[PDB]
Amino acid sequence: KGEELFTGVVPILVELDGDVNGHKFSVSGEGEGDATYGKLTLKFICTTGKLPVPWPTLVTTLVQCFSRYPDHMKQHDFFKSAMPEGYVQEKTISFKDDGNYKTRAEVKFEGDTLVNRIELKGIDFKEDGNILGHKLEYNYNSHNVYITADKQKNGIKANFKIRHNIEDGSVQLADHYQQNTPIGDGPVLLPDNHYLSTQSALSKDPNEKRDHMVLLEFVTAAGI
Ligand SMILES: [Mg+2]
């Protein structure tokens, strides 16, 4: 069973390959997760130089297997149940009055390390919009990720709305439609309707000169 692999501190590697309106970029992330406290501590670096999109727009794309599922809700943890073979996570992120991100990721164990390999494709963004014009504040709000079962594809679906704070006090709504499917042919946990309560804190490393993001995240399952 997959939950046994998450009882302690597990190292994480995140690799993103992106293209937003022709602008190519790569992000490399390193850190660790401790599912017992639903804690994520990571440092992401833009390996290609300065990013053409704001760092907050990439948080949801950049490992829900580290969510803390209370003991009474363990039978509803799809994410850990798909491990070690892993799962495919596909998202369509629709930014209100702007373009969209279509992401495809494979989340799985590579030895004792949990890896998140992502391909991101962004299209139809406005040149001076909130995203390409870098008008988003370097912070993150607390959200609820509503999960439901997709018994047809032996996985789950998630529907949530992310609100990015704009520099003028307004908000940029980023509608998310998620779909997860297991890579392996082993039995997975099909959950009842519930949500993941998320809290994210963004910061910078004072000694780092490259474009980066330090992320402290806490994810807890609720709702049942
Ligand atoms: Mg077109």
Swiss-Prot record:
UniProt effect for mutating Y140F: In Sapphire/H9-40; exhibits a huge Stoke's shift, with an excitation peak at 399 nm and an emission peak at 511 nm. In Azurite; shifts the excitation and emission spectra to shorter wavelengths and increases quantum yields compared to BFP
Effect of I123V: In EBFP2.0; shifts the excitation and emission spectra to shorter wavelengths and increases quantum yields compared to BFP
Post-translational modification comment from the UniProt entry: Contains a chromophore consisting of modified amino acid residues. Maturation of the chromophore requires nothing other than molecular oxygen.
GO biological process, one term: generation of precursor metabolites and energy
Effect of mutating F44L: In mut3.3; shifts fluorescence lifetime from 3.03 to 1.88 ns. In R10-3; matures to the red-emitting state with excitation and emission maxima at 555 and 585 nm, respectively
Effect of N193I: In mut2.1; shifts fluorescence lifetime from 3.03 to 2.50 ns
Coiled-coil blocks: none
Free-text tissue specificity from the UniProt record: Photocytes.
Consequence the record notes for mutating Q75R: In Azurite; shifts the excitation and emission spectra to shorter wavelengths and increases quantum yields compared to BFP
Effect of E217G: Suppresses the 399 nm excitation peak, leaving only the longer wavelength peak at 475 nm
Outcome reported for the amino acid change (mutating K74R): In Topaz; shifts the major emission and exitation peak up to 20 nm
Superkingdom, taxonomy of origin: Eukaryota
Outcome, altering D98E: In mut1.27; shifts fluorescence lifetime from 3.03 to 2.85 ns
Effect recorded for H143D: In Cerulean; leads to improved quantum yield, a higher extinction coefficient and is 2.5-fold brighter than ECFP
Family affiliation: Belongs to the GFP family.
Subunit: Monomer.
Protein name: Green fluorescent protein
Source organism per UniProt: Aequorea victoria (Water jellyfish)
